[PDB]
């Protein structure tokens, strides 16, 4: 049994809700929240900008030190950093950004990072300002992630479309 409330069950391991990921993290304090990161961990906008704002910029300060030591992530890659006031840990995952011309096949590699964590609160990778089709992102999630994932969808309209169209 866990804390997550109000989710629709899509599969054995994937659950979805129309919710503010920031507000959901604040309520649940999950072990892992996933950030929709870029390779520079520059949390300007989208999910990343919202998560970082909710940490009062402490996520960005920590991320800048991580990059200064380790250099950029790979597209499809991840790192584990603090969850600050939102979660125990934040898994920063880089999905491909279609608005930069990145290979959408890297979306599966991105979701494979979730399998290193038994339970996660996450957004749909490469959705929103990363330019991918969220329906496709949900399909790759279901077909890749084997651990228990609780997906938060920002738009109510999009949430309803993802549920109605789910095979
Ligand atoms: O809380 C949130 N969720 C979000 C989802 C997208 Cl795509 C963008 C900004 C967001 O801020």
- CA-128 nearest atom, ligand 1: 7
Nearest to 39 by CA among 83, 66, 75: 75
Buried/exposed code over 15-25 (b: 16+ C-beta within 10 A; e: otherwise): bbbbbebbebb
Q: Round the CA-based radius of gyration of the chain to a whole number and report it.
A: 15
For this PDB entry, the determination method is X-ray
Residues 6 or more apart whose Cβ sits within 8 Å of residue 57: none
- Residue of 123, 129, 156, 157 to mutate, ligand 1, most atoms within 8 A of C-beta: 123
- Cβ of 128 closer than 6 Å to ligand 1, yes or no, is yes
Task: Give Cα separations from 62 to 31, 57, 69, 135 (angstroms).
Answer: 18, 9, 11, 32
Residues 6 or more apart whose Cβ sits within 8 Å of residue 60: 41, 42, 43, 52
Give the number of other Cβ atoms within 10 Å of residue 78's Cβ.
Answer: 21
- Cβ of 46 closer than 6 Å to ligand 1, yes or no, is yes
Parent domain of 14: 1-167
CA 115–ligand 1 middle distance (angstroms):
23
- Cβ of 34 closer than 6 Å to ligand 1, yes or no, is no
Residues 6 or more apart whose Cβ sits within 8 Å of residue 74: 39, 94
With H, G, I as helix, E, B as strand and everything else as coil, classify residue 139.
helix
Give the alpha-carbon dihedral of 96, 97, 103, 109, to 10 degrees: 10
- Cβ of 22 closer than 6 Å to ligand 1, yes or no, is yes
Number of domains making up the chain: 1
């Amino acid at each position: 049994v866990n804390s997550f409330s109000g989710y629709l069950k899509l599969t054995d391991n994937v659950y979805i809700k129309n919710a503010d990921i920031v507000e959901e993290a604040k309520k649940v304090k999950p072990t892992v929240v996933v950030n929709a990161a870029n390779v520079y961990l520059k949390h300007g906008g989208g999910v990343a900008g919202a998560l970082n704002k909710a940490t009062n910029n402490a996520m960005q300060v920590e991320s800048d030190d991580y990059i200064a030591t380790n250099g950029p992530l790979k597209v499809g890659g991840s790192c584990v950093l603090s969850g600050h006031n939102l979660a125990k840990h934040c898994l920063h995952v880089v999905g491909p950004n279609v608005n930069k011309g990145e290979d959408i096949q890297l979306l599966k590699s991105a979701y494979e990072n979730f399998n290193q964590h038994e339970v996660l609160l996450a957004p749909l990778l490469s959705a929103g300002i990363f330019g991918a089709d969220p329906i496709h992102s949900l399909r790759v999630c279901v077909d890749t992630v084997r651990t228990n994932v609780y997906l938060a969808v920002f738009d109510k309209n999009l949430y309803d479309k993802l549920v109605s169209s789910f095979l």
